[PDB]
Amino acid sequence: SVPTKLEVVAATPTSLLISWDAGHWWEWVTYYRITYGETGGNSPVQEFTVPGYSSTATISGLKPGVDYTITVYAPTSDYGSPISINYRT
Amino acid sequence: SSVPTKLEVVAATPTSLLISWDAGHWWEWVTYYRITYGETGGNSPVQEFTVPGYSSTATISGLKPGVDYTITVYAPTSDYGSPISINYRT
Amino acid sequence: NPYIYLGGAILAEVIGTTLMKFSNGFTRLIPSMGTIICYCASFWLLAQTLAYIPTGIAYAIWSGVGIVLISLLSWGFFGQRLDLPAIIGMMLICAGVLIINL
Amino acid sequence: NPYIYLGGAILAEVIGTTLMKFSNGFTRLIPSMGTIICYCASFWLLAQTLAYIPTGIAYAIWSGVGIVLISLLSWGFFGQRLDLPAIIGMMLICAGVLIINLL
Numbered sequence: 001s002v003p004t005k006l007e008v009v010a011a012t013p014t015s016l017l018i019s020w021d022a023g024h025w026w027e028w029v030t031y032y033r034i035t036y037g038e039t040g041g042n043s044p045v046q047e048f049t050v051p052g053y054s055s056t057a058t059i060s061g062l063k064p065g066v067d068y069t070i071t072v073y074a075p076t077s078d079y080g081s082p083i084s085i086n087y088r089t
Numbered sequence: 090s091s092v093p094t095k096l097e098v099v100a101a102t103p104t105s106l107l108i109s110w111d112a113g114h115w116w117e118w119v120t121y122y123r124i125t126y127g128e129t130g131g132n133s134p135v136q137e138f139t140v141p142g143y144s145s146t147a148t149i150s151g152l153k154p155g156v157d158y159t160i161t162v163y164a165p166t167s168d169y170g171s172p173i174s175i176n177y178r179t
Numbered sequence: 180n181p182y183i184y185l186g187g188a189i190l191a192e193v194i195g196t197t198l199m200k201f202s203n204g205f206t207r208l209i210p211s212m213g214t215i216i217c218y219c220a221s222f223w224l225l226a227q228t229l230a231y232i233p234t235g236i237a238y239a240i241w242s243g244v245g246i247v248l249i250s251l252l253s254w255g256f257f258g259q260r261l262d263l264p265a266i267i268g269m270m271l272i273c274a275g276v277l278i279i280n281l
Numbered sequence: 282n283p284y285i286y287l288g289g290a291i292l293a294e295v296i297g298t299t300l301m302k303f304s305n306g307f308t309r310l311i312p313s314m315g316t317i318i319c320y321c322a323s324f325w326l327l328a329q330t331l332a333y334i335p336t337g338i339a340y341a342i343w344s345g346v347g348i349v350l351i352s353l354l355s356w357g358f359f360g361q362r363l364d365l366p367a368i369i370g371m372m373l374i375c376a377g378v379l380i381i382n383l384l
């Protein structure tokens with residue numbers, strides 16, 4: 001159910017500004033966690049969290065040209081499956 | 090037999106003053122000391138901020154050099170004793 | 180005055196425990212913040228209404244007007260039934276609140 | 282075992298409430314931290330009993346033992362600050378409590 005609709009708004013070769021639909025007031029969670037790593041897997045992935053009232057987040061420090069996989073998890077798996085996408089910088 | 094006690098200026102600086110005080114015994118420790126600082130002349134209000142009652146030190150920045158300031162440390166209520174106030178010229 | 184804030188803290192906690200049942204594990208941000216705000220207020224409301232009314236006296240009245248307002252709010256617009264002998268137990272709590280009141 | 286965590290959570294809240302009388306509007310460190318700690322324990326214990334003991338009997342015991350433990354603790358550490366018509370009013374509040382929960 002939440003989060004819903006994960007897409008990349010602005011895209012710099014080394015940064016991706018993403019966003020999602022945080023739900024709606026009474027379905028706002030306390031925090032989302034965002035996971036970005038290389039689409040391959042030669043190394044681990046990078047991760048951070050965002051408060052539940054914010055719907056956007058910036059991902060900095062990427063490598064240009066590389067395709068990345070970005071995932072946004074709810075606090076728990078009870079709010080629906082985590083939504084994931086791909087982007088080539 | 091009041092708190093706080095022994096309000097002294099550890100470090101000084103033209104624009105900053107590091108101060109400390111005697112929090113008293115473990116039963117005399119409060120949860121928040123509110124501290125006030127303004128100009129000695131008194132042609133202005135008085136700046137104020139709080140600081141956790143488990144810390145006996147407080148740093149103040151943004152002061153104007155050469156000026157003499159008056160610093161006062163309060164307790165959550167007036168029940169703990171008269172607040173302690175001092176002076177210092179940066 | 181004292182029995183006004185005690186009831187305000189009773190109303191505060193009852194709203195706190197209900198908003199907690201609505202939110203999940205403090206995950207739903209809005210009713211989670213609602214529970215934190217409610218408990219903080221009721222913590223500071225009960226703290227201020229204890230210096231006047233004795234400790235055991237206020238514990239009772241709370242346990243009373245609490246479940247009263249809990250089961251009243253329960254039958255109010257949530258579920259219903261439960262083991263309802265009658266509202267005779269609700270009228271008991273009211274009496275003790277009164278004969279301890281002003 | 283699962284019935285003990287109640288009385289411990291009862292007593293922990295019993296201790297925290299008496300410690301709140303020492304916090305002075307949460308303006309005195311050590312009692313203020315203590316009340317926050319005490320209630321974190323009774324929470325965690327009560328949450329460990331809701332998984333086994335039903336909510337009705339677990340709480341009816343809480344109201345009774347608590348209204349006895351904190352009221353007796355308010356006699357040694359203090360005594361009474363504004364006693365009024367009846368002490369039995371609290372026992373009959375507790376009575377009406379036990380008959381809208383158990384009954």
Ligand SMILES: C[P+](c1ccccc1)(c1ccccc1)c1ccccc1
Pocket residue numbers: 192195218221222238241242245294298320323324327
């Ligand atoms: C201190 P109390 C509480 C009050 C207000 C907000 C949140 C909690 C409480 C309320 C009414 C009657 C007796 C006690 C509590 C705390 C932990 C575990 C069980 C109860």
